[PDB]
Design a binder for this molecule. Structure first.
Ligand SMILES: c12c3c4c5c1c1c6c7c2c2c8c3c3c9c4c4c%10c5c5c1c1c6c6c%11c7c2c2c7c8c3c3c8c9c4c4c9c%10c5c5c1c1c6c6c%11c2c2c7c3c3c8c4c4c9c5c1c1c6c2c3c41
Ligand SMILES: c12c3c4c5c1c1c6c7c2c2c8c3c3c9c4c4c%10c5c5c1c1c6c6c%11c7c2c2c7c8c3c3c8c9c4c4c9c%10c5c5c1c1c6c6c%11c2c2c7c3c3c8c4c4c9c5c1c1c6c2c3c41
Lengths: 30, 30, 30, 30
């Protein structure tokens, strides 16, 4: 269970991260 | 500026993604 | 400029991290 | 096996990504 719960959480974290990137990518235009 | 906060946010999210993933790989060997 | 290439590189790496992770979560339910 | 091989690869990708971030973070100083 915990294994499948970490992979779910880690996916969450990864999707949170990709938000941050695209925002940062847009800012790089500025 | 925002790209700052976006990049810092992203790095954190990956660490949470990393440490969780490490628990997961551990469960597999169990 | 380099931050450009660094950000683009990072976004790609996360996608490879994402799609692999999706295969992994799938194996768990098996 | 494949499950434990994806998590290994996804960890690789995550570590590749974190290189890209820190480089990008330093560039943000400029
Ligand atoms: C905006 C910036 C700020 C605003 C913009 C909003 C969105 C997005 C950007 C942007 C980055 C900014 C700034 C920064 C603030 C600020 C605000 C603003 C809101 C907005 C939301 C989104 C949205 C993303 C966007 C990124 C992007 C990052 C950028 C950073 C910081 C930083 C920080 C603040 C803060 C707030 C907060 C809001 C929240 C929204 C979301 C998400 C998330 C996106 C991320 C994240 C980055 C990150 C943080 C925090 C933080 C969080 C939080 C909210 C979250 C959330 C997310 C992230 C958080 C965090
Ligand atoms: C440097 C930039 C460029 C040089 C600097 C070198 C290192 C780092 C940065 C930096 C980013 C740059 C540029 C860009 C080139 C360029 C070069 C330079 C070399 C260097 C290595 C590292 C190092 C990281 C560093 C980041 C950082 C990103 C930045 C981007 C691009 C981009 C691109 C080139 C290219 C080459 C190549 C070299 C290689 C090294 C490593 C790693 C990796 C780091 C990453 C990655 C980012 C990314 C890409 C590619 C790519 C790759 C590759 C090499 C790899 C590798 C990595 C990444 C690749 C990729």
């Amino acid at each position: 269970a915990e294994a499948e719960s970490a992979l779910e959480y880690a996916q969450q974290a990864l999707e949170k991260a990709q938000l941050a990137l695209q925002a940062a990518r847009q800012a790089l235009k500025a």
